[PDB]
Amino acid sequence: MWFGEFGGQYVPETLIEPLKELEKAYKRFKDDEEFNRQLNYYLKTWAGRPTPLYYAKRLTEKIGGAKIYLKREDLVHGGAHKTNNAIGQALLAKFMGKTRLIAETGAGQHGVATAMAGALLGMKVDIYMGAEDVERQKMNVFRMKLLGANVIPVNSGSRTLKDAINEALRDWVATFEYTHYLIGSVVGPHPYPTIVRDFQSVIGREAKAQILEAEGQLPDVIVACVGGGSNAMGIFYPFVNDKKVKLVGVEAGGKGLESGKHSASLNAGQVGVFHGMLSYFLQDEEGQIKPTHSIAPGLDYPGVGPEHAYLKKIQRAEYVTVTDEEALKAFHELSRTEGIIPALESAHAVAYAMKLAKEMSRDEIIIVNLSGRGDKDLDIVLKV
Amino acid sequence: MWFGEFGGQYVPETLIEPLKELEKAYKRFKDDEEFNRQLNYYLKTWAGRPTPLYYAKRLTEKIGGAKIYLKREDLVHGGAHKTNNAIGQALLAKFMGKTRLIAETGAGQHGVATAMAGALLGMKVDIYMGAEDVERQKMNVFRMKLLGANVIPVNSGSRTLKDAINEALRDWVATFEYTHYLIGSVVGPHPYPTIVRDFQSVIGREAKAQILEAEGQLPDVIVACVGGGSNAMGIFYPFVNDKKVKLVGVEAGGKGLESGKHSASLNAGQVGVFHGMLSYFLQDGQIKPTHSIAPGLDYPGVGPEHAYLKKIQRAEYVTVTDEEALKAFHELSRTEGIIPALESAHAVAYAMKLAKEMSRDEIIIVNLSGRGDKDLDIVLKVSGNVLEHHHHHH
Numbered sequence: 010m011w012f013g014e015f016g017g018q019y020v021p022e023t024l025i026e027p028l029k030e031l032e033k034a035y036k037r038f039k040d041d042e043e044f045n046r047q048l049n050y051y052l053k054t055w056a057g058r059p060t061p062l063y064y065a066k067r068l069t070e071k072i073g074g075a076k077i078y079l080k081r082e083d084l085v086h087g088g089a090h091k092t093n094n095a096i097g098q099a100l101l102a103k104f105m106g107k108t109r110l111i112a113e114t115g116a117g118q119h120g121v122a123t124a125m126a127g128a129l130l131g132m133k134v135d136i137y138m139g140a141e142d143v144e145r146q147k148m149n150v151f152r153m154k155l156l157g158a159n160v161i162p163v164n165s166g167s168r169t170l171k172d173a174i175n176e177a178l179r180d181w182v183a184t185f186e187y188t189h190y191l192i193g194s195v196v197g198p199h200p201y202p203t204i205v206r207d208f209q210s211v212i213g214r215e216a217k218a219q220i221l222e223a224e225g226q227l228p229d230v231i232v233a234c235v236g237g238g239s240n241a242m243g244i245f246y247p248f249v250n251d252k253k254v255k256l257v258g259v260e261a262g263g264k265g266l267e268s269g270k271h272s273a274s275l276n277a278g279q280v281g282v283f284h285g286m287l288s289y290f291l292q293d294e295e296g297q298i299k300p301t302h303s304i305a306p307g308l309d310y311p312g313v314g315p316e317h318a319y320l321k322k323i324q325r326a327e328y329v330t331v332t333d334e335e336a337l338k339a340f341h342e343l344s345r346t347e348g349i350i351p352a353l354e355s356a357h358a359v360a361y362a363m364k365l366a367k368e369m370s371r372d373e374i375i376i377v378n379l380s381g382r383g384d385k386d387l388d389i390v391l392k393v
Numbered sequence: 394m395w396f397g398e399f400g401g402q403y404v405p406e407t408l409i410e411p412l413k414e415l416e417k418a419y420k421r422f423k424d425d426e427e428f429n430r431q432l433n434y435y436l437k438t439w440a441g442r443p444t445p446l447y448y449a450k451r452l453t454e455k456i457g458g459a460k461i462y463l464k465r466e467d468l469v470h471g472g473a474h475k476t477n478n479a480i481g482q483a484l485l486a487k488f489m490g491k492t493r494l495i496a497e498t499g500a501g502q503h504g505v506a507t508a509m510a511g512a513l514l515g516m517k518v519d520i521y522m523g524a525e526d527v528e529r530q531k532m533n534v535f536r537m538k539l540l541g542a543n544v545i546p547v548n549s550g551s552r553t554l555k556d557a558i559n560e561a562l563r564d565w566v567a568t569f570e571y572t573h574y575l576i577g578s579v580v581g582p583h584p585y586p587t588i589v590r591d592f593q594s595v596i597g598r599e600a601k602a603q604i605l606e607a608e609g610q611l612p613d614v615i616v617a618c619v620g621g622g623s624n625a626m627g628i629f630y631p632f633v634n635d636k637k638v639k640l641v642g643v644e645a646g647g648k649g650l651e652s653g654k655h656s657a658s659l660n661a662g663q664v665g666v667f668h669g670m671l672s673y674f675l676q677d678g679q680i681k682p683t684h685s686i687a688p689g690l691d692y693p694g695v696g697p698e699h700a701y702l703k704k705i706q707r708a709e710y711v712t713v714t715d716e717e718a719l720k721a722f723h724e725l726s727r728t729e730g731i732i733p734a735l736e737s738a739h740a741v742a743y744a745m746k747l748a749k750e751m752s753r754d755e756i757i758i759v760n761l762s763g764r765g766d767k768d769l770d771i772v773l774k775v776s777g778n779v780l781e782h783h784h785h786h787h
């Protein structure tokens with residue numbers, strides 16, 4: 010439940026037994042042969058795992074320093090790593106006898122992942138979304154409907170993600186006997202930070218095997234962007250006990266840290282309680298969750314998972330920021346140099362790795378988690 | 394050269410020398426150990442091959458007949474099978490010592506695939522595109538530029554695909570010493586129909602291995618959509634000598650075959666010469682414009698190897714309408730959580746009809762040639778259709 014002092018279960022008493030039943034089921038199924046046969050089957054035949062580990066040779070040689078490898082989560086079905094967790098939790102729900110999934114979404118990206126997995130497994134799917142975000146995210150809202158999910162606009166409060174989160178929790182209180190609440194990052198009350206990290210750790214397990222095959226050694230650095238922190242935990246976790254491997258998480262610096270327009274909870278936030286967890290959040294002087302900004306739609310979550318708060322505390326991982334401008338430059342650079350259009354989220358990681366590689370020797374190795382593809386971002390990048 | 398009477402090399406004398414040197418290079422490299430090692434390296438680590446073969450269990454059980462398997466080319470880097478051929482030809486060009494790729498594009502899909510492969514291999518890329526197709530494909534144009542390609546609008550004549558083909562061909566005659574002309578389907582003068590089919594046949598070889606693993610036998614039927622015919626040849630070719638495997642190609646029926654707004658060259662076209670080949674084409678004696686809700690089923694002809702398979706009755710060719718393809722697009726999305734390309738939705742629609750005819754435990758493989766992210770704007774416009782006398786969708 011706790012990663013040092015971070016984490017917990019800050020929920021109404023009515024959710025304590027549903028969370029206990031979720032943990033009990035998870036511990037029974039996570040190493041179960043039939044659960045894992047089915048999970049691996051869907052990850053392989055529907056999602057397309059394993060994803061490759063790609064040597065960005067042209068990019069590496071241009072920069073003239075460390076080798077840059079990309080872990081190609083952009084090739085997962087749906088175009089983002091979110092699918093790994095959506096499948097894992099949807100299958101868990103089905104094994105628990107649940108017939109319905111709920112989730113919240115801001116950018117729409119987790120709503121789409123949840124809708125895809127629910128459709129695969131024949132589950133009913135309802136997605137809560139702040140009405141402001143519904144308005145802005147026309148294409149993700151349509152995708153969700155096409156996939157058979159019902160998008161429920163949330164018109165109360167500020168009509169954004171915090172309000173969707175509150176409605177989802179209210180629904181789960183009433184419907185948990187048949188409904189699974191599918192949390193989309195390494196956030197929420199225990200056991201969700203643990204479960205999500207476990208379902209994303211396939212990224213790092215593949216990457217470790219792949220870099221050993223390609224280079225005969227472990228990487229010197231792993232770089233991943235951090236919203237809530239799921240793609241970063243997924244790639245980091247299998248290397249945590251390899252002391253030599255540096256772990257770097259990259260938060261959204263937005264218009265700059267001194268600008269008021271970013272989403273850098275670890276770098277600029279403070280300890281607080283939100284979404285059922287004690288962690289770092291961007292919160293105003295009256296304890297209210299602040300609006301965030303990033304050019305990357307999915308780096309909008311106003312906090313970070315407790316395991317990252319912990320890794321930062323113990324200095325096992327370092328957390329940095331990259332600006333919209335730096336991310337955009339990396340988006341263009343990777344596209345023209347390697348013929349891979351990255352997600353704007355992932356472009357933050359690419360940007361930082363490019364900076365880092367310049368300083369490192371040519372025999373050193375950086376793996377970047379390319380968490381998604383950038384097709385979804387083309388309208389945004391055109392407008393800029 | 395030919396497939397029965399079809400195919401050939403009906404070109405001006407200017408194109409003979411570049412085609413001869415291409416044929417000679419392909420003979421040299423096609424089975425070369427180093428060429429193939431590099432090709433397979435890029436297909437694995439950049440494109441993400443192999444793609445999976447997926448048992449659409451929910452769709453199969455809903456329809457209540459034959460098993461429907463999907464060959465998941467939608468998962469290839471770029472979201473379509475075109476990538477396989479783009480990489481093959483771009484790498485061939487590099488092994489030939491070329492530094493530049495040119496191509497033509499209508500929908501923009503082959504232009505993007507060519508731009509991606511050129512970016513991968515550090516090659517200059519120029520894409521010819523009819524000015525009218527440029528105006529109607531703002532996103533694909535941007536995408537090509539983001540990938541480092543230059544898009545050259547063709548303003549001459551009709552300002553469409555036929556004109557871009559002519560401009561590309563003119564460029565190649567002038568620049569072939571250092572430029573490869575990258576054709577995007579199983580069309581054009583020899584040796585292109587053969588080369589493109591060879592670079593797509595990995596689809597079928599994987600699918601054969603995968604169905605034998607999954608079901609312990611070969612499929613009863615393979616179904617694929619047909620524009621020019623490359624995704625269909627790629628999945629068909631390794632099964633051609635497996636006598637009991639039926640092969641079905643699905644062309645765009647558009648607004649209906651009677652409507653004269655379709656792209657069904659095999660079903661309703663006439664034999665003639667265009668793009669330096671003899672095949673079926675939709676014509677007046679000139680090329681007639683085509684229609685399909687699917688952008689990439691717009692080529693006004695069809696590859697000569699399909700014309701041959703049709704003639705010897707090895708493969709059957711059918712049509713599906715816009716409306717049937719849209720229904721399949723929606724059905725696959727909500728039943729399996731896979732949003733297909735509108736092109737591929739034609740194959741899905743036909744397979745859903747065919748599966749109902751067949752017995753439980755018979756096996757259909759559908760080539761899912763691409764994903765449908767690119768098509769969401771098109772489908773949203775139909776779904777939110779506003780009647781002329783209304784102010785909002787009812």
Ligand SMILES: C[C@@H](O)[C@H](N)C(=O)O
Nearest residue numbers: 114115116118119310
């Ligand atoms: C934080 C939230 O926006 C998440 N990235 C989603 O797509 O829903």
Ligand SMILES: C[C@@H](O)[C@H](N)C(=O)O
Nearest residue numbers: 498499500501502503
């Ligand atoms: C026929 C032509 O439009 C091809 N499908 C392309 O994308 O360029």
Ligand code: NA
Nearest residue numbers: 272274310312
């Ligand atoms: Na944040």
Ligand code: NA
Nearest residue numbers: 656658692694
């Ligand atoms: Na045609």
